Amino acid sequence: ADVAGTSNRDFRGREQRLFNSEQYNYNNSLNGEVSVWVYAYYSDGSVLVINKNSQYKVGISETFKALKEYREGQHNDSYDEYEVNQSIYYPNGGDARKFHSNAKPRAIQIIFSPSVNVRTIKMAKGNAVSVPDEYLQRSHPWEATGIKYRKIKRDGEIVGYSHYFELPHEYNSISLAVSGVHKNPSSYNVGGHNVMDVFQSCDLALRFCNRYWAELELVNHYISPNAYPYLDINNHSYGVALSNRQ
Amino acid sequence: ETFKALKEYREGQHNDSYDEYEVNQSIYYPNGGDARKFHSNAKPRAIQIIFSPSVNVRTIKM
Amino acid sequence: ADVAGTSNRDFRGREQRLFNSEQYNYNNSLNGEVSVWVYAYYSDGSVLVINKNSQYKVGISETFKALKEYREGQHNDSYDEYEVNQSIYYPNGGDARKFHSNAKPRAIQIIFSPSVNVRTIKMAKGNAVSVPDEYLQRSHPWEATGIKYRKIKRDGEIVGYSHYFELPHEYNSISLAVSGVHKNPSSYNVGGHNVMDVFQSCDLALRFCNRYWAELELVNHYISPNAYPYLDINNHSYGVALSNRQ
Amino acid sequence: ADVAGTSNRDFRGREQRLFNSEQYNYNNSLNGEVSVWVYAYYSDGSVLVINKNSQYKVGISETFKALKEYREGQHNDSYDEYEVNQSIYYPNGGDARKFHSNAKPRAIQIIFSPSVNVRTIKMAKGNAVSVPDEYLQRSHPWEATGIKYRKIKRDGEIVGYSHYFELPHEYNSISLAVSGVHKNPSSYNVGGHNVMDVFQSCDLALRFCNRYWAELELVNHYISPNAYPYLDINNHSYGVALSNRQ
Numbered sequence: 001a002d003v004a005g006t007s008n009r010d011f012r013g014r015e016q017r018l019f020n021s022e023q024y025n026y027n028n029s030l031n032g033e034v035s036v037w038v039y040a041y042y043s044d045g046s047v048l049v050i051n052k053n054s055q056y057k058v059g060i061s062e063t064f065k066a067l068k069e070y071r072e073g074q075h076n077d078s079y080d081e082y083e084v085n086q087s088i089y090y091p092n093g094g095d096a097r098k099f100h101s102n103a104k105p106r107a108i109q110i111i112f113s114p115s116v117n118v119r120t121i122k123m124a125k126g127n128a129v130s131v132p133d134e135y136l137q138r139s140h141p142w143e144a145t146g147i148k149y150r151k152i153k154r155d156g157e158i159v160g161y162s163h164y165f166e167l168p169h170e171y172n173s174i175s176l177a178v179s180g181v182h183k184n185p186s187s188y189n190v191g192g193h194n195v196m197d198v199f200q201s202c203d204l205a206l207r208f209c210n211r212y213w214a215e216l217e218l219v220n221h222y223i224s225p226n227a228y229p230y231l232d233i234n235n236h237s238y239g240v241a242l243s244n245r246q
Numbered sequence: 247e248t249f250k251a252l253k254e255y256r257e258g259q260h261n262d263s264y265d266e267y268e269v270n271q272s273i274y275y276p277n278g279g280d281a282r283k284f285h286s287n288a289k290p291r292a293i294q295i296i297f298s299p300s301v302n303v304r305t306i307k308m
Numbered sequence: 309a310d311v312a313g314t315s316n317r318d319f320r321g322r323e324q325r326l327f328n329s330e331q332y333n334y335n336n337s338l339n340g341e342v343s344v345w346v347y348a349y350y351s352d353g354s355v356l357v358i359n360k361n362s363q364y365k366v367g368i369s370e371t372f373k374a375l376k377e378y379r380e381g382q383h384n385d386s387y388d389e390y391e392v393n394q395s396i397y398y399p400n401g402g403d404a405r406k407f408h409s410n411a412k413p414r415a416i417q418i419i420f421s422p423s424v425n426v427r428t429i430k431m432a433k434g435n436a437v438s439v440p441d442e443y444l445q446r447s448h449p450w451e452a453t454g455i456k457y458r459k460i461k462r463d464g465e466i467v468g469y470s471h472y473f474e475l476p477h478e479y480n481s482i483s484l485a486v487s488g489v490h491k492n493p494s495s496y497n498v499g500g501h502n503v504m505d506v507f508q509s510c511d512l513a514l515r516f517c518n519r520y521w522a523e524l525e526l527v528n529h530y531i532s533p534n535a536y537p538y539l540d541i542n543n544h545s546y547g548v549a550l551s552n553r554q
Numbered sequence: 555a556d557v558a559g560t561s562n563r564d565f566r567g568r569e570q571r572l573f574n575s576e577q578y579n580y581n582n583s584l585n586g587e588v589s590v591w592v593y594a595y596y597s598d599g600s601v602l603v604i605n606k607n608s609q610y611k612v613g614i615s616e617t618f619k620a621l622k623e624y625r626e627g628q629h630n631d632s633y634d635e636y637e638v639n640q641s642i643y644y645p646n647g648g649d650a651r652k653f654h655s656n657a658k659p660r661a662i663q664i665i666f667s668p669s670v671n672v673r674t675i676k677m678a679k680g681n682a683v684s685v686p687d688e689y690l691q692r693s694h695p696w697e698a699t700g701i702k703y704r705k706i707k708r709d710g711e712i713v714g715y716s717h718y719f720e721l722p723h724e725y726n727s728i729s730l731a732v733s734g735v736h737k738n739p740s741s742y743n744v745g746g747h748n749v750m751d752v753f754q755s756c757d758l759a760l761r762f763c764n765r766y767w768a769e770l771e772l773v774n775h776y777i778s779p780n781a782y783p784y785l786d787i788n789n790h791s792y793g794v795a796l797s798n799r800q
């Protein structure tokens with residue numbers, strides 16, 4: 001046979017490049033996943049991740065309470081934290097024994113897979129009682145924030161999209177939903193002849209949630225093993241470039 | 247359902263709740279937790295999915 | 309001196325082979341140990357080991373309750389498990405809040421040292437109230453199960469003997485005793501002139517019991533450090549061949 | 555065929571009588587069990603049973619502490635009961651918060667199977683520090699109390715033997731061992747050529763222990779299901795007559 005790495009008959013090399021290219025393009029076909037992650041960062045360095053993976057479109061919706069840190073199998077000041085929530089929902093409405101709950105998120109990062117169409121991203125960032133914009137009567141139910149998403153890049157390929165916002169102020173008390181639609185450059189509407197498949201996709205979407213102890217542990221044990229995209233506090237991008245690559 | 251939500255939960259009894267968080271860390275990534283057991287007895291041993299006779303079987307997806 | 313590994317005057321080599329041969333043969337003399345182990349395997353992957361080491365003869369006897377998993381320093385559903393035992397002892401005799409206790413053994417492995425005579429092995433595998441065969445009136449107090457023991461082998465030498473039985477069914481609820489006699493190819497009865505020494509051996513026998521978390525941990529921290537024989541779930545034999553070996 | 559119950563060719567009837575006769579006689583052969591039970595009765599009506607079943611000979615030996623009531627999975631005044639034991643072991647040696655522990659047995663019943671030879675029964679009823687008769691120097695290590703055993707009888711057959719003694723006085727604080735030898739009307743000594751089998755029987759003996767809540771529950775769920783002999787507080791005998799019976 002020909003010698004490796006010297007000719008156009010390195011079929012092991014051609015198959016490796018096609019296997020990676022096929023994964024990148026399959027993910028972008030309408031048979032592929034679109035995924036979203038919400039990372040809620042806590043002052044003790046831990047991070048809650050919520051991920052949803054589904055075909056056609058995907059989203060996550062959480063209450064203010066559900067985004068608060070919860071330490072499985074440890075104490076969580078559970079009664080005082082009910083009194084915190086009462087004061088968050090209406091000023092001076094509770095009798096908590098703390099000024100700031102350390103279970104409140106300090107920041108949110110939203111990440112989408114590179115199979116999303118960024119112009120379809122929508123976010124409902126509500127106040128603590130789940131109203132998008134002060135009163136329901138004047139609220140548009142979402143904002144289209146795609147322009148704010150940064151490209152997470154590795155070896156020049158877009159491996160995902162990130163929108164990150166800090167919640168550093170005492171009044172940064174939110175509920176949150178976010179949604180994106182899978183790329184569809186064709187003129188076949190996936191909600192036309194395929195409408196009931198999109199309805200089944202709402203049932204088939206897989207969810208994951210877990211609290212990791214540190215961004216390092218998230219990087220090492222959650223992002224990297226699964227070939228997910230990420231952007232850490234130091235603005236370093238993580239992910240795997242696949243199109244036309246070995 | 248998530249992997250966690252399918253695990254056994256005994257309402258009103260002990261559930262090894264802290265050790266079971268450490269189990270989940272090791273399930274999510276090998277050697278990622280510090281649990282005090284090799285196999286959680288809260289893991290399902292089997293799943294049965296049943297549909298009513300009004301389903302069309304050719305539309306089932308998992 | 310002669311060069312190592314080239315002549316009949318490698319006395320360091322001859323002494324190493326005699327030191328190993330002397331250990332194998334000492335164990336088989338009447339001055340040597342005979343040992344037995346009962347491994348009770350639990351569904352959480354942990355394993356209770358009971359070992360007895362004694363001269364002349366050796367055995368272990370445990371109740372149904374004593375073979376159930378007990379996690380030192382953790383919760384054990386201790387009250388519900390009393391109600392489980394009542395229902396095991398007589399159908400519908402307890403008020404437990406579970407159908408199957410995960411503290412019941414899923415399997416037993418009995419291992420003897422290679423100094424046992426296999427034709428002397430006896431086992432009393434009782435029901436949960438410690439009756440060998442349904443009712444005491446028709447029970448022979450043991451079965452001689454030596455024919456079932458497999459040879460655990462390493463480098464062609466018998467390093468021990470194994471009888472393994474699963475308890476996979478809900479009705480597999482046992483009490484257990486097992487006994488073997490040390491090899492004695494001579495016509496000197498150890499219970500003749502030496503009878504009171506055999507009585508002292510009943511007091512001198514050393515016992516060990518402990519629950520390990522996994523078969524891996526048993527292999528690494530219990531079987532291997534002590535040069536004990538074992539057979540794991542994959543039918544791999546562990547032990548150290550010594551007769552005529554360096 | 556002949557009609558049932560009218561001729562000497564009712565072979566189903568002859569086989570039923572032989573099956574029962576064979577059980578009674580097998581139990582009395584040297585291949586059969588000999589069994590002993592110690593029942594310790596508590597003031598709350600519960601009963602601890604300890605049973606041992608073995609070939610050739612059988613016994614039970616317990617400390618004063620081990621005979622005290624223990625409620626699995628409930629509170630047992632465990633610290634105060636250590637202080638009780640100190641005062642039982644030497645007058646005024648503890649600092650308990652009670653005059654009489656309700657965990658002390660109020661009575662003991664010893665029962666042997668009908669395969670025991672009553673003239674071989676021995677009992678060591680010690681004081682609370684495990685001395686048979688005041689000081690070790692003047693103690694014979696047992697008393698042969700066979701003459702005191704009553705025959706438990708059903709349909710005129712001896713189904714077992716009972717010795718019962720109350721412990722109603724505050725000074726009735728005991729340790730206890732008891733032992734009997736299986737019948738052997740032959741001149742073959744089971745400790746002669748068969749000595750090492752008797753040594754293995756010491757390992758093969760099966761033990762059971764459990765606390766039942768009431769004599770009724772003992773009768774219904776422990777004695778009767780297993781065809782064991784018993785004598786209740788009302789002097790009623792329980793057991794199954796088998797010799798020459800259908």
Ligand SMILES: Nc1ncnc2c1ncn2[C@@H]1O[C@H](COP(=O)(O)OP(=O)(O)OP(=O)(O)O)[C@@H](O)[C@H]1O
Pocket residue numbers: 153154155156157
């Ligand atoms: N020294 C170089 N000269 C020319 N091209 C390079 C060099 N190093 C890498 N490249 C190529 O340039 C393209 C961009 O890769 P690069 O590593 O700059 O992007 P990235 O990893 O997305 O961003 P960065 O490395 O800046 O965080 C890829 O095709 C890569 O193979």
Ligand SMILES: Nc1ncnc2c1ncn2[C@@H]1O[C@H](COP(=O)(O)OP(=O)(O)OP(=O)(O)O)[C@@H](O)[C@H]1O
Pocket residue numbers: 461462463464465
């Ligand atoms: N390739 C070989 N040819 C001939 N003899 C060998 C070879 N490999 C090992 N032996 C010898 O064969 C005997 C059996 O050793 P072997 O390793 O087969 O037994 P084991 O470890 O009991 O069983 P196994 O290895 O099959 O689990 C020993 O004397 C060993 O030194």
Ligand SMILES: Nc1ncnc2c1ncn2[C@@H]1O[C@H](COP(=O)(O)OP(=O)(O)OP(=O)(O)O)[C@@H](O)[C@H]1O
Pocket residue numbers: 707708709710711
């Ligand atoms: N009315 C009777 N007349 C003659 N023999 C009888 C009668 N009733 C029972 N028997 C027989 O008498 C023998 C003794 O049985 P019996 O029921 O008196 O003994 P038990 O049950 O040991 O004692 P008890 O019934 O007094 O507690 C048995 O052979 C039995 O079949």
Ligand SMILES: Nc1ccn([C@@H]2O[C@H](COP(=O)(O)OP(=O)(O)OP(=O)(O)O)[C@@H](O)[C@H]2O)c(=O)n1
Pocket residue numbers: 074075076077078079080081083095096097
């Ligand atoms: N505003 C607050 C906070 C706490 N407590 C009291 O202090 C006890 C413990 O507080 P809790 O907030 O429940 O914390 P932990 O028990 O430490 O944590 P968890 O309940 O999460 O296990 C409570 O039962 C409640 O009596 C209270 O009165 N008022």
Ligand SMILES: Nc1ccn([C@@H]2O[C@H](COP(=O)(O)OP(=O)(O)OP(=O)(O)O)[C@@H](O)[C@H]2O)c(=O)n1
Pocket residue numbers: 073259260261262263264265266268280281282383
């Ligand atoms: N890997 C594990 C498991 C348990 N524990 C400790 O042991 C205590 C009890 O364990 P937990 O798993 O919480 O079990 P339970 O309290 O018995 O059950 P639950 O919490 O479900 O009521 C915990 O508080 C924690 O201190 C631990 O350090 N590490």
Ligand SMILES: Nc1ccn([C@@H]2O[C@H](COP(=O)(O)OP(=O)(O)OP(=O)(O)O)[C@@H](O)[C@H]2O)c(=O)n1
Pocket residue numbers: 260382383384385386387388389391403404405627
């Ligand atoms: N059939 C059962 C099981 C448990 N419980 C009750 O629930 C409490 C806790 O159950 P237990 O079985 O003792 O379990 P743990 O306390 O979790 O474990 P351990 O006692 O082994 O520390 C008990 O005190 C008893 O009140 C009960 O009524 N009935």
Ligand SMILES: Nc1ccn([C@@H]2O[C@H](COP(=O)(O)OP(=O)(O)OP(=O)(O)O)[C@@H](O)[C@H]2O)c(=O)n1
Pocket residue numbers: 628629630631632633634635637649650651
């Ligand atoms: N002479 C006694 C008896 C009890 N106590 C104290 O009271 C507490 C409870 O008593 P204990 O005898 O341990 O009873 P329980 O806790 O009710 O039962 P258990 O320990 O059997 O669960 C103990 O921790 C010990 O502080 C004591 O000082 N002196």
Ligand SMILES: [Cl-]
Pocket residue numbers: 029030031
């Ligand atoms: Cl497509």
Ligand SMILES: [Cl-]
Pocket residue numbers: 337338339
């Ligand atoms: Cl010898």
Ligand SMILES: [Cl-]
Pocket residue numbers: 583584585
């Ligand atoms: Cl016989």
Ligand SMILES: [Mg+2]
Pocket residue numbers: 073262263264
């Ligand atoms: Mg806990």
Ligand SMILES: [Mg+2]
Pocket residue numbers: 077078079
């Ligand atoms: Mg609390």
Ligand SMILES: [Mg+2]
Pocket residue numbers: 154155156
């Ligand atoms: Mg780069």
Ligand SMILES: [Mg+2]
Pocket residue numbers: 462463464
């Ligand atoms: Mg080999």
Ligand SMILES: [Mg+2]
Pocket residue numbers: 499500503745746749
């Ligand atoms: Mg002799």
Ligand SMILES: [Mg+2]
Pocket residue numbers: 385386387627
């Ligand atoms: Mg308890």
